[PDB]
Amino acid sequence: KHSVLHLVPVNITSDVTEVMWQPVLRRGRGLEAQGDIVRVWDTGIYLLYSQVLFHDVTFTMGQVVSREGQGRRETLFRCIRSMPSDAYNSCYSAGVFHLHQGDIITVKIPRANAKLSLSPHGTFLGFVKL
Amino acid sequence: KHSVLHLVPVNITSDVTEVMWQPVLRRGRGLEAQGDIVRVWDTGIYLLYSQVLFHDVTFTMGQVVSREGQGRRETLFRCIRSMPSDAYNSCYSAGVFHLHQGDIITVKIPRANAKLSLSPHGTFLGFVKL
Amino acid sequence: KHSVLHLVPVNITSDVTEVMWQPVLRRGRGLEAQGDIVRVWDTGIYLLYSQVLFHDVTFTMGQVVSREGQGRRETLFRCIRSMPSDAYNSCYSAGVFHLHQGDIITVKIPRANAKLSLSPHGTFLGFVKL
């Protein structure tokens, strides 16, 4: 029986845009959403998945998922999508990573006031301890 | 040892298009494909993943994955992709959700006679009990 | 506690382009990267995920993930993405498959000298025994 956390947006805060996250599914207690980041309390291997739904015209959009721990900062994975010059695209990515207690997980979109959907069905972030 | 179900198309039936599903991998017995829906017999937390391969010209395409249970209907997640005006795009999404026995899982594409691939390598639906 | 393998590029080798893979996370011992393929030593059910980050102009890009075992060759899944005529797109796909010891897993891009990113955050391949 695995520990899990599935998070959806509460609001979008504006080089960078981030998402304030709220839990809608939680089992176990080794992970905690604290506003726009997720704290890791339990060292382990986790499946981490991220989707962002973008509405921006023209430019390449994508999210970057990173870990910052005892002294260093590391990108884990990124999703990238070209947008039509006209409108709509979800960007999903996921992978398996060793996370260390004390780690902070960030999901950042490297554009100002990025037009991201608040919809829980389109933009979400989650974890499964493996 | 986890219960799992991986499903692929048998045919595509035409506001809405759906897929008739057939199992190609099954372990355990808490899930059942019944034509264009999947019944959940066992309450639990599941990773649910969905890919659809689209061939439509011009318009935004995407699939919507939902649960209908004791009295209510809920979208779980959606995938969205703009299509070139020219041709080809897979749309993958997945997440972790608490499903209740008696639940019906639907995968719907909100366009008439949507040009979806029957290929099992391009359009598929699956579950892993966590 | 699941066996896992997360692999990233070392270099890209040129009808076909493949990736030479190196492990960055490994638990258990039922899987082995050997250059551009992955050998399966342990029969089981695995979540297999693949992302490729493409930089090619114009044409439809995508990767194909296959298994070759005792006498037969089988596509497992593929990801497909149209590219702008202008630039950038990640293609992620994943699914659950029964793999047999002795199996060889391949990730192929069906274009010559495909412009793929070596970045470990953009192009990766992984496995979780279920």
Nearest to A87 among B60, B79, B94 (CB): B60
Give the length of chain A: 130
Looking at the DSSP bridge assignments, the partners of residue C107 are: C65
Find out whether B54 and B89 touch, Cβ atoms under 8 Å: yes
DSSP state of C51: E
| A16 CA: distance to closest CA in chain B (Å) | 23
Distance separating alpha carbons of residues A90 and B65, to the nearest angstrom: 14
Find out whether C120 and C26 touch, Cβ atoms under 8 Å: no
Distance separating alpha carbons of residues C37 and C47, to the nearest angstrom: 17
**C96 vs B51: CB contact, 8 Å cut-off?**
no
What residues of chain B have any CB closer than 8 angstroms to a CB in chain C? 1-2, 4, 6, 25, 27, 49, 51, 53, 83-84, 86-90, 92, 94, 121-122, 124, 126, 128
Distance separating alpha carbons of residues B1 and B118, to the nearest angstrom: 30
Instruction: Tell me the CA distances in angstroms from C91 to A125, B98, C63, C86, one per residue in order.
Output: 18, 27, 8, 18
Distance separating alpha carbons of residues B63 and B96, to the nearest angstrom: 17
Distance separating alpha carbons of residues C15 and C119, to the nearest angstrom: 23
Contacts of B118 in chain C (CB under 8 A): none
Q: Using alpha carbons only, give the angle A74, C55, A86 rounded to the nearest 5 degrees.
A: 105
Query: Which structure tokens are listed for A58?
Result: 């023209």
**C45 vs B27: CB contact, 8 Å cut-off?**
yes
Please give the residue of chain C at the shortest CA–CA distance from A92. Answer: C92
Nearest to A75 among C4, C92, C121 (CB): C121
**A27 vs B45: CB contact, 8 Å cut-off?**
yes
Distance separating alpha carbons of residues B61 and B56, to the nearest angstrom: 8
Find out whether C127 and C94 touch, Cβ atoms under 8 Å: no
| Residue B66: count of CB within 10 angstroms of its CB | 18
The CATH number assigned to the domain with range C1-130 reads 2.60.120.40
DSSP state of B46: E
This structure was determined by: X-ray
Query: Which structure tokens are listed for B45?
Result: 């937390």
Distance separating alpha carbons of residues A45 and A96, to the nearest angstrom: 7
Find out whether B125 and B7 touch, Cβ atoms under 8 Å: yes
Query: Which structure tokens are listed for A73?
Result: 């900062």
**A45 vs C27: CB contact, 8 Å cut-off?**
yes
Distance separating alpha carbons of residues B91 and B61, to the nearest angstrom: 9
- Identify which of A47, A60, B12 has the alpha carbon closest to the alpha carbon of residue C81: A60
**Which residues make Cβ contacts (< 8 Å) with residue B53, sequence separation at least 6?**
B88, B89, B90, B91, B116, B117, B119, B122, B123, C80
Find out whether B126 and B4 touch, Cβ atoms under 8 Å: yes
Distance separating alpha carbons of residues B67 and B79, to the nearest angstrom: 16
**B89 vs C81: CB contact, 8 Å cut-off?**
yes
Contacts of A122 in chain B (CB under 8 A): 77-78, 80
3-state DSSP call for residue A103?
coil
Distance separating alpha carbons of residues C115 and C118, to the nearest angstrom: 10
| C37 CA: distance to closest CA in chain A (Å) | 19
Distance separating alpha carbons of residues C76 and C65, to the nearest angstrom: 6
Contacts of B80 in chain A (CB under 8 A): 53, 88-90, 122
> What residue type is assigned to position C87 of the chain?
A
Find out whether A95 and A47 touch, Cβ atoms under 8 Å: yes
Contacts of C47 in chain B (CB under 8 A): 128
List chains adjacent to chain C, taking adjacency as at least 3 C-beta pairs closer than 8 Å. A, B
With 0-12 CB in 10 A as exposed, 13-18 as middle and 19+ as buried, what is A107? Answer: buried
Distance separating alpha carbons of residues A91 and A81, to the nearest angstrom: 7
3-state DSSP call for residue C32?
strand
**Which residues make Cβ contacts (< 8 Å) with residue A87, sequence separation at least 6?**
A55, A57, B60, B82
Distance separating alpha carbons of residues B28 and C37, to the nearest angstrom: 31
Place of tokens 């039922």: C30
Place of tokens 């090619």: C56
> What residue type is assigned to position C38 of the chain?
V
Distance separating alpha carbons of residues A101 and A129, to the nearest angstrom: 13
Query: Which structure tokens are listed for A130?
Result: 């493996």
